[PDB]
Amino acid sequence: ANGCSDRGCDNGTLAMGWGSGTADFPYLVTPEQAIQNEILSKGKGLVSAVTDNGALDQMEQVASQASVSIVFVNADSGEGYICVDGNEGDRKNLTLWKGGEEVIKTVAANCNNTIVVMHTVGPVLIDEWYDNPNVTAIVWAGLPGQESGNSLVDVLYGRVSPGGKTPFTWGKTRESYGAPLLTKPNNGKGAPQDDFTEGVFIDYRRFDKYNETPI
Amino acid sequence: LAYSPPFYPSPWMDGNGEWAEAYRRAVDFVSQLTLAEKVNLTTGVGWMQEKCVGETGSIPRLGFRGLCLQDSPLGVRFADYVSAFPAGVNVAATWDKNLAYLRGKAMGEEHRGKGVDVQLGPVAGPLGRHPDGGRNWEGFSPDPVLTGVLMAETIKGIQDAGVIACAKHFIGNEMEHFRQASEAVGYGFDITESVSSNIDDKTLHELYLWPFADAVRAGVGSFMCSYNQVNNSYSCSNSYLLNKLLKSELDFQGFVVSDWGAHHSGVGAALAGLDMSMPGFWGTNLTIAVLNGTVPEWRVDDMAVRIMAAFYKVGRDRYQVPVNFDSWTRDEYGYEHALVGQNYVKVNDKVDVRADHADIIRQIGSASVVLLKNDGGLPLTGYEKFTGVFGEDAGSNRWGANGCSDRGCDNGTLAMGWGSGTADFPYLVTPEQAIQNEILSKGKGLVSAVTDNGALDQMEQVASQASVSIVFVNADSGEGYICVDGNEGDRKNLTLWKGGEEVIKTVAANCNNTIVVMHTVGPVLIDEWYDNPNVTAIVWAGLPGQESGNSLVDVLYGRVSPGGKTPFTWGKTRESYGAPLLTKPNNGKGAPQDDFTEGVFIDYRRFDKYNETPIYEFGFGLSYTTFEYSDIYVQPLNARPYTPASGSTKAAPTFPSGATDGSPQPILPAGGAPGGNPGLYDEMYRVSAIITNTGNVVGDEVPQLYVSLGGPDDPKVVLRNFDRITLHPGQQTMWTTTLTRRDISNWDPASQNWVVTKYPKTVYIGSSSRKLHLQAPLPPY
Amino acid sequence: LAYSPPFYPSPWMDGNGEWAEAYRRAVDFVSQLTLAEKVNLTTGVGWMQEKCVGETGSIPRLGFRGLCLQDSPLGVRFADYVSAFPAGVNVAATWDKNLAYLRGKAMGEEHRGKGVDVQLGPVAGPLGRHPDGGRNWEGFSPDPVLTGVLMAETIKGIQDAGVIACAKHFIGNEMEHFRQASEAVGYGFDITESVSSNIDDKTLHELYLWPFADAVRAGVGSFMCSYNQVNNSYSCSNSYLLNKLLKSELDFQGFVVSDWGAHHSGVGAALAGLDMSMPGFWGTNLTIAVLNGTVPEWRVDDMAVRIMAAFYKVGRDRYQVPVNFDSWTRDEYGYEHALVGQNYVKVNDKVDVRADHADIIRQIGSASVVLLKNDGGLPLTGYEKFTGVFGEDAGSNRWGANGCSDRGCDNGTLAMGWGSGTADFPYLVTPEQAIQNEILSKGKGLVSAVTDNGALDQMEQVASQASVSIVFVNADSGEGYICVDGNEGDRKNLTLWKGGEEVIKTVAANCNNTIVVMHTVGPVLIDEWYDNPNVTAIVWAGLPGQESGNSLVDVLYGRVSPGGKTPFTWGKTRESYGAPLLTKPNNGKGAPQDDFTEGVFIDYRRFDKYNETPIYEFGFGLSYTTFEYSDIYVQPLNARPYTPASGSTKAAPTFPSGATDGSPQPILPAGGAPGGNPGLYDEMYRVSAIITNTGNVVGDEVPQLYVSLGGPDDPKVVLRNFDRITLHPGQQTMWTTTLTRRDISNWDPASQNWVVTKYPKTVYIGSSSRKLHLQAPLPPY
C-alpha cells in the first residue's frame, strides 16, 4: 500500500493522490477484498476479480457469465516534483488511466448489468461510455483513504444510500472547461504569465455562461 | 529390450461377493442387447462431440443414454457452479482416512448433481517415483500404503455418493516426458512411440501395484490404462498388465477404459483386457471382428457386462439425472444439427452443486498444513503491531482465479496444479485477503502486502518494521500438454518459482521473526534458508483449493493446531532422491526406456538405504502441543497358514494363443478374490502403543507403524499403518492396529505369490519415518 | 442457401498441343503400373512422415521415389542455405513481368537444388477481396489482370527451372476466418463446416477465375483446391469448380492436389475432379472403390497420368535429384525405423542453393518501393549532417531473423508475413544497418536509431536535431493457424502496428523533414498523417525479404529512382473498401455464409462505382522524374468472328449421375484449349501512345491501359494491360499493346460464354486508375 514513495504511482486501487499531500496507509482495504468479503458472508455466489486491464479476453469471458459486473477505473495526479506516465503533477489529459475506457467497453459489451466505479482526482471525459445502456450504474468514489473497499461496499450493497454530489462539473470536452493549462513558457527565460482572463467563470459558472450542457 | 509376456484369455467377471447384485442386473440388461448396442457401450463418441470429456454410445431403444465420463480427481472439470477441492497431495498430508472419504463423498455429490456417471479419478499412478514428476500432486504419496489407504477411502466416498470412480493411471506413468509420441513431437523430439516404464515383477508388486490392489478391494468401478508402455507393451494393450495382474491376480470385476487416445492394438486391445475405448473406427472393427470370430462373443459380452456392473454397483440407475452442463462452452444455449436444419437448444443449466462443500475444503486445507519448523514463531494472535505479508504467492491471480486455462500458469497464490487434474474456482480466498481480514477483525495493527517478487526494496522497507513477516513461495507443475516457464509438465528443477528463495532471504535479513508458507506440488530444495535463525517457522500448505487463505489462517492464528505430516521427503539435493528424470530419448526414434533400476527404493526408502539424512523426513510434522509414546505391545494372533488359491473359473458365458479360449481357466496362486488371495488380508499380529498429549493445547498426532522385513534387499522400514488422533492436554489413548499377512510379506516371482521370509521382522511405532520411538520383534509362528 | 450444381464426368486429359509430349510419356509410364502403384501417386504419406511438407507414395519397382511437395510461394520453406525472396505483393508493386519471371526462375532453381518436385505456389487466391484478408500478401493484387499476368510469369519461371508449380488456392479463400472448422473451434467458435464463399457465375468468371485461367494457359503443372466451400460445396469435392470450370472450360491438363486436410467426401472427391490427397488413409479406400466399380478405372488412370504429365512437362525426369534436406529438423543425421531395428541415416546435406539470388532479391526490393508522396524529401545524399532513424520496424528481430516460428511475430523490421507462405532468412539486412552503412561510407554525418516505439522522449530528442528523420512503421498478417496480437490471420483493423502512428506524429512534430517508410502486408488508414506538411515523403516498401535495408537505401539515396505503383487502393476509411470481413458465424453451427454481393466491385472498382476519392488510387506511384503521355492511336485488327467450341472428347482411356460415364463428352462452347476457347485470345485492337521522360534523371514509368466496357453494371474502368519502362532524361518510347477478345468481353451465364456486348467501349492510357491521360473509342466491327 505504501510501496510508492509519496504515492507516486497508479498501482492497484487509487485511494490517494501523490506528493506532499499524502500519508502512509496503516493498511488499505481494496474493492476486490471488500466485494469478496461481502459475497462470501452472504449468498456465497461466484466471484472472480480480473485486475489486469490488459486481460481483455478474461474480462469478456467472466463478464458473459456474470449477474453483475463491477468495473473499476481511475485517474491520478499530484505535486509537480513527481512525474508519473508523463503527467508532470498536472494531468496531461482527462482520460482514464491504464486503458480504463477499453475495460469499460469490453465488459459492457458482454454484460448488460455493468456498474462503473471511478476513483479519480477530478473529472474525466466519459462521453463515449456514460450513456451505454449496458452500464446500469455509475459512481464516483474519489480518493477514499484506508477504508476504500469497505466504504464503497456499504453504499453498493445498500447499507448506506449514496448522498454525495459532484463538487465539480463533468463536461463533454476539455474545451468545455475553458481555462487551458499553460504548459510551455510564454515569456522567454522569465516568469511565464498565466492570465486568469476567464475571471470568476470557472467550472460550472463557465458552462452556464456559454450555455454548454454538462454530462 | 525388456519384455512383456502374453497372457490370455482375458478373464471374464465372476460377479461374486460385493459384485453379485451388480453382476446379476448387468447380465439381465446385456441379455437384451444387440451386438451393435453392446459395442456402443465400449465406444467413445469422439473428442468434443458431446457434452462430457468422454461419452459412450447410447442405447436409445432401451432409453439408455451414453455414459458421461468427466475429469477430475479434485472436482468437476469444465463446469460452472462447482467447488475446487484441495489436491490429492494435500489429502495425503492429512494422513486422515475420514477426511479423504468425506472429500470423495463431496466430489461424488458434485459429479452426481451434474449428471456425471464416471469421475476420472482418483490417482495412484503416478505414485511419485520422481520428486520432479509433473502430475504427482494429483495422486497422494510416493509411499504405497499411505496412497493405497487414502485412494480406497476416496473411492468409497465417491461411489457411496452414486458415481463410478476410475482408478488411474494404470500403470507406470511416473513422468510426463515422452508419455505420448505426438506430444513429444510437439516439443521437438523425434520419437514414434511412448516411453516404456521397465519395472521388474518384484518392484511392481511391492510398490506401484499395491495401491491399485487397494483400489480394487475398495470396490472401484473402473480403471484407466495409461499412455506409457510397461516393458515395451502399451498399458492399454498389455495382456500381462490387464489380463494377468489386474483381472486375474487382483481379480478386478469392473471395466478398463483407455486414457484419451492411449495407443492400443485396436481389436487386439480388447483381447488383452481393454473394455472401453476413449475418446473415440473401433466400433465398426469390433462389430466385424465379432462377426468373423476374431473376437469371441463372450469377450464383448464381458466388456459390456463389466461396464453395466459398474453402473449398477454405484446405483447409477437411481442417481442418474440428465447431463446439465457442457464441457466446451459456458453459454446457456447453442445450435445443434438436426435431422432437418438445426435446433437452438439449452446446453448449460448452471446447476449449483456446491452445497456446503466450502466447509470440508477449508477443513482439509487446515488439516493438510504441515508444521516443519517452529522456534516460537507460531501461532500468531492477530494482535501483532505490524504484520508484513510477502510474495506473489500471497496475492491474486490478476487474470481472475480461472484466468489461466487448465490453471496453466503460476499467477498469484498457488492453490491447484495444471492440466486435466483441475476444476474452476467458484472463488479464491488468497492469503493476502485472509491475513488482512484476521488482523482487521482483531487487534487491527498495521498490515501491508508486497506481492511482487521483484519488489525487494519494498520488502526490506516493510520487513524491517514488522513484528512478524509472513513470506509466501510456491512451485508448480502439471500435465505434459502444458508447458509453463520451460517446465514441460515435469519440473525442470526443484527450485522455488519466481525468485522465491531471494524473497525469503531478503525478508529474513530484515526481520528476525520470519514465517515461510510453501504452496508446492512437491518438495523443493530448502537447504540454503530453512536453517536461517531469523526464519522462526516454516509450513508446507500444498494446493488447498478455493479456501486456501482461510484454511491457512485457522492454523497460523491457532484456531487449529497443525497436525499434517509431510507425505514425501525433503532432501538436501536433487541427487538425494536418485531416480533422475529421462528428458532425452535413448532408443533412437523408438520408445525411450525409463528403467526403474532403483526398485522399491524411492523417496524415504532411498534416503534410508543410502544413509542420506533428510532435512524433513517422510512422516514428519510438528504440533502446537507435544506427544509422548509408550508401552508398545505385540500380540501374535496365530492366523491360519496361508493357502495358495486354486481351482477353476467358470466357462466364459454369453448373454495370439489362448485369446479366443472361453474354457474354464486355472486360478492364480495369488489371486482368487478382488484385491488378491483373501488369505493375504488375514491379521497376523495386533500391535498397540500409548500416545499421550504432554503439552498445553488440544492437538492431533499422526502415530505411524513401520515394519522392517529384515532381508538385505528390504527397505530398513516401510510404512504399514497410521491414524490421525485428537488428544486433549493430558489425555492418553491406546492406538491398536493389526498387521496383515501382506503387510509382512515379500513378492516371490518364482512361485508367483506373496511369501513371509525367514528374516526376522521388527515393528516400530513413532511420529515419523526417522522418529521411531518404540519397537518390538515380531515373533514367528 | 447457395447451391453448386453437379458436373460429371471428371474430364480426362486430351494431351493436345503443348502437352502432347508430356502426355505421351505419362501414358508410357502409367501403362506399366499396378493399380496400387497408381493409387500411391494420388496418396500423401501422412503429416510429417517423410521429408517434404508433403510426399506421394513411391513406386520402388521402377525406382520411382514419391514426389516432394514443398512450400512456399516466396522460397524453400523449412530448409537451410536458401534465400528469402520478396512477397508476392511486392512483385505486384513492381508491375514488372520480367522481374516476376526471374523471381520464379530463382525460386525454381532453389527448389530444384533441394530435390523438390512441386513448389506450392504461386498464389492467385486469395485474390484480395478484403483489404484485411490475412494472406493477400502471398498473392499479388485485388486486380485480376495484374495478378493473372504476374502469376503466369512466376509459373513460367519456376517451371522453366525444372520444378512443377502449383496454383493455389482454388478458389474463394478470400479470408482466414472460418476456413477450417477445427481451426475455428481452436479460436472458440462453434461451427462444424468451413465457410462457404457464395459467388455468382459472372463474378467468378470476370474476377476470381481470371488469373487462374492465366495460370492454366501458362502451362502450370498443378492446382491446389482450397479449404473453404464455394456455393456450399468444398472446393476439393466441388464438381462444378474442378470438373466444369477448371478441367472443361479452362481445359486444365495437370493435376489437382488438396490443401492439407482440405475436407472432401473421400472417394467421391476423385469423381468430382480431385487427383491427389494431401497430406494423409484414402489409399486403400480408392483401391477398393476401383475394385468394386464405384470409381472407374479410367478415372484413377487419368489421376495418375495427370500427375506424371506434370512431372514430364517441367522435365523432372532430367532435373530430379534426391531430397537433400529435412523439413522437420536441421540435424545432419537421424534414425529411421526398418524392417528390423533402426537405421541411422543422413537427413540434411546442407546444400547451398542461394547462388547469386541476393542480387535479384535486392533488385526486386528496390523495384517494389512505391513513392506515394514527395514534397522535396527524396532522394537523400548521404551527406546529411544528422540522420534520425525511428521505429522498431527499422531494427533487428532480437530473437534472430528466424527467431519467430513461421515468422509469427512482428519483431523488428517486417520483411515477410507469417504462416506457410514463408522461408528462413540466410540473413536480414535491416534499415538501421543499411542507413548507417550509407552515412558512414559517405558524408559521415551523425546518425542515431531509436527502434523502441515506446521511446517517444528519445524520438523527440533526436528528431529535433535531425537534418532528416526516417520513420519506419509496419502492419502484419498471415495464415489463420497463427494469431499475433489478436489478429487471427486476418487483420483485426487497418491500423499501423505497435503505435506506429504515434511514432510518426511524435517525429513529425519535431522534424520538418520527416520521411515515412511503410512495411505493410496491405493498406492501412493514413488519413490522419499523410497530409502532414512535416512529412516530406512517404514510401511503401512491403515485405522485401533478406535485402530489405539495402534495396530500400538504393532508392532513398537515389541510386534507383522509385517506379513501383501501389497494387491496391489506399482509402480514407475501412468502409471505403466495402466487403467487411465476416468474423462472426451467421449460420449457427453450420458453414458460415460469405456472400460476395459486391460482385466484381472490389478495391478500385468499388471506389470508382461510388465516386469515392482514395488517398492513393490503384496504380499510383511517383518518380524522381516526370513523364508525359501523348498521341494515342487505336488500330482495329478485324479479327475472325468468335466461334463456340464444338465436337466431342474421345472416350476415357485406360492404361452421382454421370460420374462413371467414360463415353465421349461434348466440349463446352467456352472451352476447347488450356485457358479457354482459343478465339478468346484473338487480338482485336492495337493501342499505342508515346511516353517521354520530361525530367532530369532516369526513371521507370508504368503505363497502364484501362478499358470501359460500357454496360450499366460494368466498372467504370478495368485494367487490361501495363508495362514497366526505363526512360532516360528526354528519352521517348512508343508503347504498344493489343486487346484480346477476352479483354473486351463479359461473361454471359445464359449462353455460358464470353460475349462482346453492344455498348460502346472506350480505351484509356494513363499513369494510374485515376490519372487517365489519353483516351479513344474502340470502333465497333
Ligand SMILES: OC[C@H]1NC[C@H](O)[C@@H](O)[C@@H]1O
Ligand atoms: O481429460 C481426460 C484424460 N486426458 C489425459 C489424462 O492423462 C487423464 O488423466 C484425463 O482423465
Ligand SMILES: OC[C@H]1NC[C@H](O)[C@@H](O)[C@@H]1O
Ligand atoms: O503447408 C502446406 C499448406 N498448408 C495450408 C495452406 O493453406 C497452404 O497454402 C500450404 O501450402
Ligand SMILES: [Mg+2]
Ligand atoms: Mg457441443
Ligand SMILES: [Mg+2]
Ligand atoms: Mg476372477
Ligand SMILES: [Mg+2]
Ligand atoms: Mg523424419
Ligand SMILES: [Mg+2]
Ligand atoms: Mg479437354
Ligand SMILES: [Mg+2]
Ligand atoms: Mg470474407
